[PDB]
């Protein structure tokens, strides 16, 4: 479950709650996905999970208030290309990748701003690699 979001190893993981490495072919081939460059990972991360994506967005402009720079995201989902698209359409300097932005989303999500701190807190509990982010 902590792998299932924000680890980039879900497709490489032999077990997805009991699931082998597939699902990537067909529906993505029926209509080609216009994204690439770790397109699998954003299908998995908490900012890329459609229901949890907007919860990060609700965190995002709370983080934006925390960072004192306000700007509206293009979509309710946060991933690699959308953040680049959001960049190319006014914000803090020093971060330009989605890896650190998801970090700043998650630590604020680990604050009692939404009742779904439980997911963010559990992610930082395991593993020890995620513990240092908190």
């Amino acid at each position: 479950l902590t792998n299932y979001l924000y680890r980039n190893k879900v497709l490489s993981s032999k077990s997805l709650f009991g699931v082998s490495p597939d699902f990537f072919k067909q529906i993505l081939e029926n209509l080609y996905i216009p994204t690439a460059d770790f397109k699998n990972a954003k299908f998995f991360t908490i900012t890329g999970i459609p229901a949890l994506s907007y919860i990060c967005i609700i965190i995002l402009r709370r983080l934006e208030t925390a960072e004192n720079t306000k700007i509206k995201f293009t979509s309710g989902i946060i991933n690699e290309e959308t953040f680049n698209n959001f960049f190319r359409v006014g914000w803090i300097k020093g971060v330009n990748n989605i890896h650190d932005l998801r970090v700043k989303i998650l630590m604020h999500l680990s604050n009692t701003a939404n009742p779904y701190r439980d997911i963010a807190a559990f992610l930082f509990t395991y593993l020890k690699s995620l513990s240092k982010y908190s």
Binding site: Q26, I27, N30
Partner: peptide, 29 residues
């Protein structure tokens, strides 16, 4: 796009109606 599932799936079924516009139009009505 003729198959909603893998080629190993479409072996049991048949995408002939999706491939053929005549059957595609006949099935709609």
């Amino acid at each position: 796009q003729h198959q909603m599932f893998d080629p190993g799936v479409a072996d049991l079924l048949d995408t002939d109606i999706l491939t053929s516009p005549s059957k595609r139009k006949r099935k709609l009505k």
